[PDB]
Every structure is written in C-alpha cells, then in structure tokens.
Design a protein around this ligand. Sequence first.
Ligand SMILES: CC(C)CCN1c2nc(Nc3cc(F)c(O)c(F)c3)ncc2N(C)C(=O)C1C
Length: 274
Amino acid sequence: VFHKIRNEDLIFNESLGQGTFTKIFKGVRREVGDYGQLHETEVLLKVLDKAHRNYSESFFEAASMMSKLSHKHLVLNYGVCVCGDENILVQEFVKFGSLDTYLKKNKNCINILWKLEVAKQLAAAMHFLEENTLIHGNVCAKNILLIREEDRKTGNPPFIKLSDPGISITVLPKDILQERIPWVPPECIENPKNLNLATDKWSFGTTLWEICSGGDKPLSALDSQRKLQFYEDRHQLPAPKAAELANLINNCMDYEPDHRPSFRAIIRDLNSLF
Ligand SMILES: CC(C)CCN1c2nc(Nc3cc(F)c(O)c(F)c3)ncc2N(C)C(=O)C1C
C-alpha cells in the first residue's frame, strides 16, 4: 500500500489551502536520500478532516492510484504519516502551486502557445491513464501543479503534473457533486455510478476551458440548482475569448459519453494547431 513516514521526520508549516474535506500544508521532511545523504525535503501534507474520517478509504485509494503507476506528468507520492488517529498523505511539493491560481495571477501574459503546451502535457497524462484504463475522476486546474515556469529567456516551455483526484465522487454527498458542475459530467450527476473513462474526457474539456479563461471558474454565477438546470437544458460552456480551443472543449464536453474523443485523437487535434 503505502510507505510509512514516522511522526518525527515531518514538520508541519504553512497552510496552503483546502481540498474536499481536507486541509493542505507545506511541510519539511528529514530523510536518508541517495548515498546515505541526509536531506531536508519540502513536502505536501494533505490532512483528512477530523470530522470526515469516514472517507478515509477513498482518501487513500486516490493516492494509491498515482502511487501504483509512474509517469513524468503524475505527482509523486512519498507515503503516509504515522501519528494519532489522523490520515496524512505525504506528496511531492511543487513550488509554483496550482495551475488554477497560476492561470489567474498570470492571466495577462499567458499566450495561446503557453496554453497549448500545458494542454498537451495534460492530454499526455490522460492518454497514459487511458491506456492503463485508470479512471482519475477529478481533472481540474486545481489538481494541476506547475513544476517549472515557462522560461522566456531560452524559450523553455513550462512543465506540469497531475495530482490525485481526492475522495471519489461515487462516495461524496450530492451537495458537493452538484457544486462541482461542470467538472463532474452530466451522467455522473444523474448517477455517480456512471464513473467511467469517458468522465475524464468531459473534465478535460472543462479544464481546457479554465486554461483558456485565465483562472475563471465556469458557471461561477450559477448556484447548485441552476447548475442542475444547466445540464437538463443540455447547454454548453461559452466560447472563451481565446477561442482557438472552443471546438475541442465542446467536442470533449459531449453529453453522449460514447462520443467523446479518445485522448489519442485529442493529442492529434492538439498537435495540428500551428
Ligand atoms: C491547496 C492547494 C493550493 C494545494 C495544491 N497542491 C499542491 N501544491 C503544491 N505547492 C504550492 C506552492 C505554493 F506556492 C502555494 O501557495 C501552494 F498553495 C501550493 N505542491 C504540491 C501540491 N500537490 C501535490 C497537490 O496535490 C495539490 C492539490
């Protein structure tokens, strides 16, 4: 399952934000690295809420998903912290934070080519999961970490990684799922048991909309019931001003799950864009 990291090797520091029923901190880990060297390693510490330890199993299965596979675009898991009755996941710390908050703060000078490079790296990660038939279940700009910024000095592209999906939507209450529209596909709003490989194709289109919207959350002005109304009326997200990917967003966000393109074809269509 997971490697056990003991209490004394970890130091909890600043709170970075929240996940679903979790608190997230920047931490420091003392470890023996390569060649027996002692390392002070920055880590991420996801602490499942004391009130929500019900979801302890789903909390660790999502991390036991990125752990049993290895890929350059997947966030590394370090293990589980042993202390009290708490549930702590120890994961790779990324300096530049979420793509969600990065697209927002850098919306002014992120051009189409920057969005395209991040879009390909995300599709490449999803293509890797599709070939392994591994359902992620929570693709969004918040679960994406920016490891390297774009270097305009040498034209070096940015680099991203995809973190774990957190507690599965097949287990979360209905108020959270309806709040996650339009990231959760319409067939999962009807029934969370429809979680499938086609779910990640829909959520990829929503993330692709976030990337072209400069941090904007789709359907922010709509509440839960008007998001449920959004799906029943079979509406689609508005075309972003940076519209060179609205056709791919709408094609991925297909109300018929069996018609959403495979991430194979998504990459071809992405690569055929100047
Ligand atoms: C709650 C949100 C925001 C945490 C996002 N997040 C991560 N963030 C960071 N670095 C980070 C850097 C910052 F300068 C910062 O202000 C910040 F908040 C976070 N490293 C690893 C992750 N890993 C693995 C994750 O799964 C997730 C979800």
